[PDB]
Amino acid sequence: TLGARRGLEWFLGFYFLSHIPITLLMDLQGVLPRDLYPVELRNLQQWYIEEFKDPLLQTPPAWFKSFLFCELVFQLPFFPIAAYAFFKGGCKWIRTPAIIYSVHTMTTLIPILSTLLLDDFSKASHFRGQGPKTFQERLFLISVYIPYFLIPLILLLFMVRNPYY
Amino acid sequence: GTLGARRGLEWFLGFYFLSHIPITLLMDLQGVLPRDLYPVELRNLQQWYIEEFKDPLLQTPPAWFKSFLFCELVFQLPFFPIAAYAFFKGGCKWIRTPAIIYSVHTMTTLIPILSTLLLDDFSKRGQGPKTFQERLFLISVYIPYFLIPLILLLFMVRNPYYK
Ligand SMILES: O=C(CN1CCC(CN2Cc3ccccc3C2=O)CC1)c1ccc(F)cc1
Ligand SMILES: O=C(CN1CCC(CN2Cc3ccccc3C2=O)CC1)c1ccc(F)cc1
């Protein structure tokens, strides 16, 4: 495996590269002041909220805000370092850091995916109206979060086993 | 003593993983397992803790908190006896990557728990901490499950006896 191994490294590199605009421009809007973001980016996030009926990014809970702070202080600095190593290739120094990132991101998203799939968004619940009401809406919203669990899982199994790391 | 700091932490982690088995099985998993699997005295004992210290998570377990409790059943509890043996015996390089995975996972589960106790509002959703002293007591009973895994992560990242 030398062509499929490098192709996975290119895929991981773009995942950590494209995560920098996504985290900065769309995700950190839930913790950073709204005055740091232009009006266009703020209205773009409201489009997503009403299109996908996301209950977490609008009125973010304290447990979700803790993960967004973890994304700013820990995950965001690692994205540029991770993209370089996987683009370059052969960087054995990224194995243990990538295992730390993979388990961390997977752990944050288990409660996130379990909330969207099972938690109740009825009028009695604290969400009070917002959120997915049908099952097709729950899959529609889960599909936005599920990449950030599968790709870190691929990275985890790729780091623990591959003798090149 | 003549154990040293390095051996003393190996023993310390062993008793941490050892005592984690009864604590998880008899107290934690009451939030995800049926009531009948537990004697009424264990359920009333946990109820005393919930009423006294105003635990909001154990009272009515939220969906996010229940997902971590299931991770404790499926992932952490099977790992507890394996890690206790590796650190009691000593010199087990095979525990490095597994214990790192446990450390990051447990630390990550505890971050939203501690942040909710400290900063969230429990006024207008069941009982919860009101005073800073009440939040401080609740942080004291959850904080060891963040510090000890953090010490473990730092212990496995750069100990040459495990690489
Ligand atoms: O919260 C995350 C990751 N988010 C990544 C962005 C996504 C929100 N989207 C998707 C989208 C598409 C088109 C236009 C606009 C948008 C838009 O706004 C919602 C999950 C997270 C990732 C890792 C982690 F550890 C914790 C949280
Ligand atoms: O949830 C935990 C750890 N809990 C350990 C048990 C504690 C709940 N208590 C404390 C107590 C004292 C006296 C009588 C009864 C009780 C009683 O019932 C509350 C945190 C956790 C640990 C690691 C992890 F990864 C996820 C969760």
Side-chain angles (χ1 to χ4, degrees), chain A residues 15 19 22-23 26-27 44-45 47-49 52 54 57 64 67-68 70-71 75 79 101 104-106 108-109 112 144-145 148:
Chain A
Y15 170 74
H19 212 335
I22 291 181
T23 294
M26 302 306 302
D27 292 349
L44 178 59
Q45 200 193 35
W47 172 84
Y48 163 81
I49 289 164
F52 292 78
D54 190 307
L57 280 175
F64 189 83
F67 291 151
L68 294 183
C70 291
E71 194 171 2
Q75 308 177 30
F79 300 157
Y101 166 82
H104 172 75
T105 309
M106 290 167 60
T108 60
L109 289 173
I112 289 176
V144 190
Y145 287 88
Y148 309 98

Side-chain angles (χ1 to χ4, degrees), chain B residues 14-27:
Chain B
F15 297 106
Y16 163 80
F17 286 113
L18 195 88
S19 61
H20 215 331
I21 300 182
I23 289 177
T24 297
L25 283 169
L26 300 174
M27 289 308 179

